[PDB]
Amino acid sequence: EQSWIPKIFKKKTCHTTEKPTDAYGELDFTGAGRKHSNFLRLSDRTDPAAVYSLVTRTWGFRAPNLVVSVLGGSGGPVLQTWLQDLLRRGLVRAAQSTGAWIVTGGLHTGIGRHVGVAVRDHQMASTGGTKVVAMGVAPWGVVRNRDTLINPKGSFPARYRWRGVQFPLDYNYSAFFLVDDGTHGCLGGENRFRLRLESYISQQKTGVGGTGIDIPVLLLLIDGDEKMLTRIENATQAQLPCLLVAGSGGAADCLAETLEDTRQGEARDRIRRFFPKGDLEVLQAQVERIMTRKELLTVYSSEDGSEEFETIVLKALVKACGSYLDELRLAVAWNRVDIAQSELFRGDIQWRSFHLEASLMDALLNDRPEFVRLLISHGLSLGHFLTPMRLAQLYSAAPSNSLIRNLLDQAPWSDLLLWALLLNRAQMAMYFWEMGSNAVSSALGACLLLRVMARLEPDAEEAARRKDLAFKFEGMGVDLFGECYRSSEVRAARLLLRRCPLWGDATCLQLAMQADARAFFAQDGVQSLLTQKWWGDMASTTPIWALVLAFFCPPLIYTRLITFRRCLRRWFHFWGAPVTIFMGNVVSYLLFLLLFSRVLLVDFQPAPPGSLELLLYFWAFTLLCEELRQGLSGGSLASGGPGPGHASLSQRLRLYLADSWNQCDLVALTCFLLGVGCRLTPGLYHLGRTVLCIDFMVFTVRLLHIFTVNKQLGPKIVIVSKMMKDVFFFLFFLGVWLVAYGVATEGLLRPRDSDFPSILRRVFYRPYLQIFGQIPQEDMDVALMEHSNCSSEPGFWAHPPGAQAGTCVSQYANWLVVLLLVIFLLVANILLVNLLIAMFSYTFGKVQGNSDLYWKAQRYRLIREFHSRPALAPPFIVISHLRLLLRQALEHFRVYLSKEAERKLLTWESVHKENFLLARARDKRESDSERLKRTSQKVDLALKQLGHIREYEQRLKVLEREVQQCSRVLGWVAEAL
Amino acid sequence: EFVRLLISHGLSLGHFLTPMRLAQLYSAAPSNSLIRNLLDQA
After folding, report:
1. 3-state secondary structure of A66
2. How far apart are CA A130 and CA A119, in angstroms?
3. A199: exposed, middle or buried (C-beta count within 10 Å: 0-12, 13-18, 19+)?
């Protein structure tokens, strides 16, 4: 695998030399575990920046937040029980709450064996995730079995054997640094590597960018021995780390007594420690070098036990700093919320503004969404916070390298909302939308921007998040509009249609259209607005017959029947509505078909053409012109199309030829041109008629695409195209079963008059008309024909009475023909047709629910097409094109309001939004599964408070017994002596 | 339910599983008709 490890890191032998390093790789214990632990042999006096870069970069460890270092020696008996409680409650629960490390002498049977027991017990007790990591620094020279690790290329698994002064390696850790100095069995022979590593960690920033704090580090000592004071004084003189001294040990309680003062030093150095030591420098150096400063040391409380440990750590680590680190930035660097809870809600110290204003910047970068609610709820106003230098700094952080970094390689709340939407943070984005201003338009725009940016990234793990976040925004927008349509439908109609300035001159509905949001058109209020849009200017659900009677006679609109200086505006309002230009288009098209039929049936003689064909040619030229206008005027940004504004001719040409109906009309026009050019040349008169009669069919079948808009045929026309998965199955099965019957029948009868078309006819075409109730039996039997022998081959022959069935049919074994007829009719008639009915029913009942939604989506585009179309008939399309080429959507697409009504309307909707979110939150709060959780927490609290009451009865009974004994003794000395 | 406890915070199985032990474990046959009948041929 890697090979730079024996290139950089060195080792030493038996005043010594330097060589490349062997014996490295992963290590495996044949036990219950989820990973193989890493180890490395390395030489002393190496720059620890390299080994820190090794641990962070190559191996999969995350950069730490807190480095504690257990540093003591008990000598190896079993410890008393409350020390086990301390290491089992305080240095493991805190160490997996925050992502932390534990640096320990990594051998077995040392102080670290108890640490391993505590880690193992806490993993075996419960599973809360994020298993406790630990490194082990140990000297090469006391490990029991060598020669199963050392190999010059290296072993990636390594089986390890305990049985087969030395020590084994413990099996609880995840990293093994083996320092070497050159010896065999010198315990306690490497410390300066450990001190320089511990010191190098505390000058390195945390987080992604270098913004926040330096990593805190602390040395925790329970009882040691007579040389541990040197280890204390080296660190606390050199690098200023905060210390912590566990009370009631046996070699650090001397420091507790000499710090609790604020010669007796000889009284202390022989009472709370090993009395044979030699009072020569221990009283002077190994106490005075420690007690020359006291802002660093801290006595841990012996009367106050566990469940307060990180509070004591936090207080000591703040206190020793002032010999700028604060409390909130350290809390945000961890993930604990309750520390911020107590610090904010506690009324002992009034909080300033600079602390919050600085710490919010560190909260936004490392994606801690639960803290921003606290830091902005009872804190600062954001108008003080957001400054353009700060926002430039926030954009300046780029946490990834491929999404916004690649899109910048080419280069107040909504400003944060775009920032949250670019970098894929869900729990930030919901909060910034909920504290937003323009409610409904922002949701659909967010859905649009996610659907666009989902394409450019390569992976699928990103797309499975982007599509889900887009569905979440679309659903939230749908429910918000549904909770506003309930009251004052005029207000909702005014809200939906208007223009939102934050994204340019675009409306809400067009943004919903270009992102393909089905569920937003799915609901009913949008449908009821599109209905009134489609009835045009000033009509309301007048029936159809009034419209037809108005369109037939123009002096009936000035009267009572229509329902809504004066007349010349009334006449312009009536013909502007789309439901009238639709009727005009349909009437013109039917007149075109009737004229074409009267040309084809009676006329179209071999002659010079005349007026009744020149009218048709003029008509076809106008239809080609209108098709060219629709094509050139110009699709869907959700696919990745070129979008509005300007695009290429090579883009619009590719766009236009993908929708099938215009492709069919183009084919129809070219076939029409082929026929009408065929005719003008002489000598090919018949072929023009033959082509043009077929092309009439393709002109006629387009009369279904026009009626897609209407209400009662809309969801019915679309389903017919999705039922083409079964007609092909029917044709396959029937063709295979049909050809065999045809060949077998014409083999048994043997007609003695044969050609190619007669045989092809009598094999295919005659069985095909037998499944539709036409069964002629004249050519099948012989017992209906005349026994006539006119044939020359030997046998017996019969004469058919019909036509096309030859003139001679054999009679040998004629009953097989009748039996095959019965078999074929029973198969095709009784099984296949009924099976096809069953398949249509089962396909329809499934696909109906999707087809209805897809029809509801496209109705807006089909309405929008008709308004841009010219308002005159194809007999007046020359004058409409004259008005178009004389100077070379507005209705129900922009409503302009007064700004006081705008400012009122946004308040009206913001009230409903703030009501809606609170209603949903309280409905989740008062459910029937969170009652159980709060009762669980309250019963746990009650049990914990009940745990204090028990010992008071024991101590109070003991004290009352002592008072009774003292009263008995005083009464004895008074009245008994 | 005991083997999780005796192997979780206990020994490594590379020490435990030895071929004499595994022969002893196969040597126990709790039934008389399924593996006993299929070792009647062996």
Report:
1. strand
2. 12
3. middle
Q: Tell whether A33 is within 8 A of chain B (Cβ).
A: no
Chain A, nearest residue to B15 by Cα: A161
A646 and B CB contact within 8 Å: no
What pairs with residue A817 in β-bridges?
A: none
Query: For A369-408, where are the E strands, in sequence order?
Result: none
Residues A232/A220, Cβ–Cβ less than 8 Å: no
Q: Do B12 and A159 touch (CB under 8 A)?
A: no
CA dihedral A142, A147, A148, A150 (to 10 degrees): 90
Q: What token pair was written down for A574?
A: 């009536």
A694: tokens are 């077929």
Residues 6 or more apart whose Cβ sits within 8 Å of residue A144: A162, A166, A167, A168
Residue A716 has a CB neighbour count (10 Å cut-off) of 12
Task: Classify each residue of A664-682 as buried b or exposed e, where b means 16 or more C-beta atoms within 10 Å of its C-beta.
Answer: ebeebbebbeebbebbeee
| DSSP assignment string, A571-632 | HHHHTTSHHHHHHHHHHHHHHHHHHHHHHHHT---SS---HHHHHHHHHHHHHHHHHHHHHH
Tell me how far apart the 2 most distant CA atoms of chain A are, in Å: 166
| φ, ψ (nearest 5 deg) of residue A135 | -105, 160
The pair phi, psi for residue A528, each rounded to 5°, is: -70, -25
- The answer to whether the annotation marks A120 as part of a ligand binding site is yes
Contact A70, A104 (CB under 8 A): yes
Short-list A486, A507, A490, CA closest to A498: A507
- Experimental method, per PDB record: cryo-EM
> Cα A656 from chain centroid?
33
Resolution (A): 3.8
The answer to whether the CB of A162 falls within 8 A of the CB of A145 is: yes
Whether residues B8 and A124 touch (CB distance < 8 A) is answered with yes
Q: Does B27 touch chain A (CB under 8 A)?
A: no
Q: Which residues neighbour A955 within 8 Å (Cβ) at sequence distance 6 or greater?
A: none
Q: Distance of alpha carbon A391 from its chain centroid, rounded?
A: 26
For residues A540 and A460, give the distance between their C-alpha atoms in angstroms, rounded to a whole number: 50
